[PDB]
Design a protein around this ligand. Structure first.
Ligand SMILES: NC(=O)C1=CN([C@@H]2O[C@H](COP(=O)(O)OP(=O)(O)OC[C@H]3O[C@@H](n4cnc5c(N)ncnc54)[C@H](OP(=O)(O)O)[C@@H]3O)[C@@H](O)[C@H]2O)C=CC1
Ligand SMILES: NC(=O)C1=CN([C@@H]2O[C@H](COP(=O)(O)OP(=O)(O)OC[C@H]3O[C@@H](n4cnc5c(N)ncnc54)[C@H](OP(=O)(O)O)[C@@H]3O)[C@@H](O)[C@H]2O)C=CC1
Lengths: 397, 397
């Protein structure tokens, strides 16, 4: 029956995912597990009427229960504020959500065999973490651009000279990082490895800045030897520092299945609707899993019309299965764990079953070469994911 | 016979390319064209004995005649200084060469059909330009990191605050660019398009820094409208600004054949011995064309042994054919132009002729799966490039 689910946060979405999000709850999640949900609407009007207050009210809950999940929501813009008669510009709910949570976002393609990739060789996805601003300016004429660090503890001020613009103008900037944040990035990176048991690779460009990587190279390595190395080395997982061209070579040469990292994003070898974006918290309890794509606006603007369209759920599903199978690690539950793990099967295997959406079929055959009988629509594809799931449960337990 | 060649600089190399460089001169270049060469040895001992003075003596010549070409040379390191009993550490000859020349380096894979790539769809190579240091530091404790720009013209000093480290430490940095350099990067980028008639794409990440791109986005656009736009638009070529994920998507979706650009490298879809790296000067006369790979040390260390090895010339060749076919644009020569253009055929077509080296066959079949009868060695492959060239001239003129 419905099975005991912990307390698993939710966040309602906007547009074509707010659709897709629902059929996932009602077909693919509710029937089977019973999670006690705290479901905090991020639907734009509610964010608009209640003026940002619901976003926080959720972001503080996810930190409490330790598992959130999120539909893709519309960051208002000029048009977005104006379309719905919104009463304000609303910074991206994530920027609200994330910075309340903290943490580091790991985007992970979910890889299917029949889906073409960038590397033909990748069996497992590379998970790409990235850390995360800065101040810059012009210098319209000659002068000394010299960054000046004044200590607040009272001692000798220490400054350096970045450059001297003598002929005319130029451009110049600062950047910074707090070791505090950097250290949350290691833990988010390390336990995202341990969550997946994958090898972690920090990457840097050493030559270009030495002390700067020299913290990032060390401040992980200062954590690895210190802590996770035991849980890494035994458990077969392990960490390695690396350099861009070094790995991004082997990253092209490998099967995948490692936790990348970087410093300052979509790109990807899969479609936008394949990418799953998990915000892992630095404490390792709390996991906020949203599909990486947008609200699939082109698809919805045709759904108003009732026109039959194809919007790929799998990223939205695998929000849940990163949330469900996380709660099960916090709860040491295998009734919740095995459910997702089998849902991720049924979700992916459905595409090895030939049942795909238009965006995937438009990956394979190309843009024109797809015909409506080459794929399944936004509603049809979802329905199979129930069909194969229950048939899977039929033979599972 | 030998045909009238202008004045085309040369630079001798080290190790396995200093080999490969020669057979290219003697088989593939000398017999056919007679260039009046100013050939300035960069062989390490000569750089070591004459203590950097020959590198400059060449770098000032290339700027004079306007066409250089360069074998791959060994930047000394600890081991490299010590191996040859070198009397000093020698900064990379390019850093000497380039900074004397100035300019911007455009690496270009030379693409063959039978050679696998990153994108299956690329018919033409993407040319990736990149502009080019900086000062960074730690901040061991609390304080104000505030970049401080003092004008030298005497007016109000203007500073900004990058961040305030309050709890403990962190890391922080400056960076800069002179509009002067940035403007050489446009011209190097623009005439590298016009040299090839390819569309140029600047790329930036706008959000992350606004005014900073705001120069780079403008300072090209300020040059395009100003000058090349006529020579671009008519002549069918054109410029477009772009953003990373925007193009690096379409860059995955395209045939290739555009001049990329970036801001702060090998990577690549071809082998290291396929990449050709052309340093284009901002004045558009002077072109310093080296193969992008190294001196192929693993191959040479086995060439001392006499062991029969495979070192792929094509990058070293296409140094010349970027130099030869450049001189012909400065000289409005079609006896020199058609030679290279036909050599690049014969060089690439040789690989469509199935004649390849081990590194390419090790691209296709994989590392183990290649057998010595799957490819041709360092000497054999070169020899065909004479065989097919002369047979090509037999039917050409
Ligand atoms: N917080 C979040 O998670 C994010 C939210 N957003 C929201 O989305 C809006 C902009 O995103 P949007 O323009 O939709 O970009 P998306 O890529 O999310 O979707 C719109 C376009 O991308 C393609 N696409 C994306 N996902 C799919 C899918 N699952 N199936 C088929 N096609 C897909 C579609 O191409 P085609 O239909 O031609 O196949 C469509 O033209 C913003 O207003 C923002 O609010 C955006 C990014 C992240
Ligand atoms: N200024 C320049 O142009 C540059 C010069 N260098 C010089 O080279 C040295 C380091 O480079 P290196 O270690 O040789 O790296 P390279 O990639 O240039 O060559 C060495 C290794 O790379 C592979 N490789 C590279 N080119 C080829 C080729 N044409 N055919 C087959 N294999 C190739 C080889 O693998 P395998 O043999 O297993 O196939 C070999 O193990 C430095 O000392 C430096 O002086 C380096 C970079 C740039």
């Amino acid at each position: 029956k419905k099975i005991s689910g912990g307390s698993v946060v939710e966040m309602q979405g906007d547009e074509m995912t707010r659709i897709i999000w629902e059929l996932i709850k009602e077909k693919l999640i509710f029937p089977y597990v019973e999670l006690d949900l705290h479901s905090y609407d991020l639907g734009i009007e509610n964010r608009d009427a209640t003026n940002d207050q619901v976003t926080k009210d959720a972001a503080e809950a996810i930190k409490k229960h330790n598992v959130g999940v999120k539909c893709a929501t519309i960051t208002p813009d000029e048009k977005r504020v104006e379309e719905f008669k919104l009463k304000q510009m609303w910074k991206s709910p994530n920027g609200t959500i994330r910075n309340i949570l903290g943490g580091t976002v790991f985007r992970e393609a979910i890889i299917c065999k029949n889906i073409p990739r960038l590397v033909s060789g990748w069996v497992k996805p590379i998970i790409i973490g990235c850390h995360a601003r800065a101040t810059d300016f012009v210098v319209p004429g000659p002068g000394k651009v010299e960054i000046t660090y004044t200590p607040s503890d009272g001692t000798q001020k220490v400054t350096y000279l970045v450059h001297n613009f003598e002929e005319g103008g130029g451009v110049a900037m600062g950047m910074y990082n707090q070791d505090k944040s950097i250290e949350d990035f290691a833990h988010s990176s390390f336990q995202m490895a341990l969550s997946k048991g994958w090898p972690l690779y920090l990457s840097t460009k050493n030559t270009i800045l030495k002390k700067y990587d020299g913290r990032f190279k060390d401040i992980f390595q200062e954590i690895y030897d210190k802590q996770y190395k035991s849980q890494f080395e035994a458990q077969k997982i392990w960490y390695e520092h690396r350099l861009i061209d070094d790995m991004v070579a082997q990253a092209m040469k490998s099967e995948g299945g490692f936790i990348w990292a970087c410093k300052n994003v979509a790109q990807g070898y899969g479609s936008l609707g394949m990418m799953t974006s998990v915000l892992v918290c630095p404490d390792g309890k709390t996991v906020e899993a949203e599909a990486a794509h947008g609200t699939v606006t082109r698809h919805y603007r045709m759904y108003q019309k009732g026109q039959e369209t194809s919007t790929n759920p799998i990223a939205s599903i695998f929000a849940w299965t990163r949330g469900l199978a996380h709660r099960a690690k916090l709860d040491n539950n295998k009734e919740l764990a095995f459910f997702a793990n089998a849902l991720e099967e049924v979700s992916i295997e459905t595409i090895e079953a030939g049942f795909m959406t238009k965006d995937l079929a438009a990956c394979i055959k190309g843009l024109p070469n797809v015909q409506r009988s080459d794929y399944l629509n936004t509603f049809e594809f979802m329905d199979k994911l129930g069909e194969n799931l229950k048939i899977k449960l039929a033979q599972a337990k």
